[PDB]
Amino acid sequence: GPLNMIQGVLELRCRTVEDVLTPLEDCFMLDASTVLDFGVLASIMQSGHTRIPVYEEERSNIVDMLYLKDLAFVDPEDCTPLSTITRFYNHPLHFVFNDTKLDAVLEEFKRGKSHLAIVQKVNNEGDPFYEVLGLVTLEDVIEEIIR
Amino acid sequence: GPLNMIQGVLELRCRTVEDVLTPLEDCFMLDASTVLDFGVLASIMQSGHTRIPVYEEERSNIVDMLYLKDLAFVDPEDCTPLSTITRFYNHPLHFVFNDTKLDAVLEEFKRGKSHLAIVQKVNNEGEGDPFYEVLGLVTLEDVIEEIIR
Amino acid sequence: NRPAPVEVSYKHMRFLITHNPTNATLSTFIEDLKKYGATTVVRVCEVTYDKTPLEKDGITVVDWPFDDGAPPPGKVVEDWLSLVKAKFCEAPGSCVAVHAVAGLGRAPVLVALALIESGMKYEDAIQFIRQKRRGAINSKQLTYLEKYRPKQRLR
Amino acid sequence: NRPAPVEVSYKHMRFLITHNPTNATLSTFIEDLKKYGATTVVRVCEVTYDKTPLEKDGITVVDWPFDDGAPPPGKVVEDWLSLVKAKFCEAPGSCVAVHAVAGLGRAPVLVALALIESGMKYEDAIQFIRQKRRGAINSKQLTYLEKYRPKQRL
């Protein structure tokens, strides 16, 4: 417990997002042009994610976040694309950089923002471009403390 | 950040469940005899809870836990009472006492136990048989909140 | 709020402390009695439930009521000790169930002075019960329980 | 990797730095142009998407291409500054959209020396752009841009 946890809390100041993220291939995610039938609904139900990144076309192109609580009053008879459902509600995209300190992302985390932040690195190896690596969650940091 | 947090981790060992708990009147809960039509489904959806205590009769009488992921495959106009859905899957109830230290509850959560524990106290006023007394629910996030603030 | 049945083994005598059921909840209440191998229940609270299904499933229910969180009157204690001694004779192995309202009161008390009567020391009796059910005896039934003196009556 | 449109207001001038869209993502690309009140897009990358839906909806698209991570050639900067003042003359209020590939490069550069031409100090140009969009200009183009100086054309 507590001694492990205390230095966890202070190596918040030394670990970057780039050590505790989920890289983008293993992240639960949805194409916008996907459509609420009962099966997509169900697979989201037992996915056990409550907030899912919504991309168009390519996965490294996140346009929105779907909340579980959002699809409470969409009916799935109705075959409605997630594209539309996702700006029924403007949900925040939280963007953060690879070399951001973990405690800073934490401070960010309960400064209200979405508990899922998405990770960018700049790349220069030509115009510089941002480069999506994956997602970090508040629980990724939480576990960095409590283990 | 970290000084507050280190201090959280330090009095994890002296703060008890009883003031970081949600007392029972504020908790999201369901009567067993309630029935999955689409509106109750929707109200659980937008409840934003993934784990809900199911009581019979009185609220201080918790019989099961409904998981969100459980109702993935019930069809809700096939309108079936929550009692039976909750006997499709018995999910174990986690019971804990008020004067339990927070780090111990942390350990209880930290392999397998439901992230939802229910809180009971013994009571000795006045004379009769002592009885257990439900106060409310504690979540793992109630404790997390005690560290990260 | 009624907590789950708790077994107290020592000596090779075996007690099960339970709640008073309602008998919407009876089938399951009988079921933990035969899982624990109780063939005899001692109730000491109000009669709320019908014993005759339990009698038909081969469990004798004994009604020895005394008041809420009072110590056992002396007749009740002697009967308790003698019933216990007779039952663990009749088959070694089996359980005796005792319950009042919620198993945190009179029933732990009778388990307790059964334990003292077997010659476990008192403070070990209490704290043995209190290991398994938190905060079990109230004050006057503890005041009762060591001006009690065992004269040996269980092996 | 394509980041969301970013507005830069200064002067009472308003630029929107954007990514290059596809023809598939084109509907939404037009829609943030009309949210931000852009009536003019300046593309400076390769031609990928068809411009006729956009001026159908009343947005002029201007093709002034110069190559990946190069500074603007002199023709391009002069045309840029003059288009900018003409459009902010024609209606005060509106936005000019600029985009290259991903809006982290040449288009921020043109916004930048527009700002310097407005007589914001140089590193307050870079200042202002890098706060909203981190790590936007590369090598050669900020080397370019301090050896740039305004005769204040805006």
Author numbering:
A (entry chain D): 298 to 422, 425 to 446
B (entry chain B): 298 to 446
C (entry chain A): 5 to 159
D (entry chain C): 5 to 158
What did the published study say regarding this structure?
Recent reports have shown PRL phosphatases bind tightly to the CNNM family of membrane proteins to regulate magnesium efflux. We report four new crystal structures of PRL proteins bound to the CNNM3 CBS-pair domain that reveal the effects of cysteine disulphide formation and nucleotide binding on complex formation.
We crystallized PRL3 C104A with the fragment of CNNM3 that had previously been used to study the complex with PRL25. The structure of PRL3 with the CNNM3 CBS-pair domain is the first crystal structure of PRL3. As observed in previous PRL•CNNM complexes, the CBS-pair domain forms a homodimer in a head-to-head orientation with each CBS-pair domain binding one phosphatase molecule. Within the phosphatase active site, arginine 110 (numbered as in PRL3) provides the positive charge necessary for binding the CNNM aspartic acid residue. Outside of the active site, arginine 138 and leucine 108 mediate conserved electrostatic and hydrophobic interactions. Crystal structures of PRL3 (C104A), and the oxidized forms of PRL2 and PRL1 all show a deep pocket which is closed off in the complex with reduced PRL2.
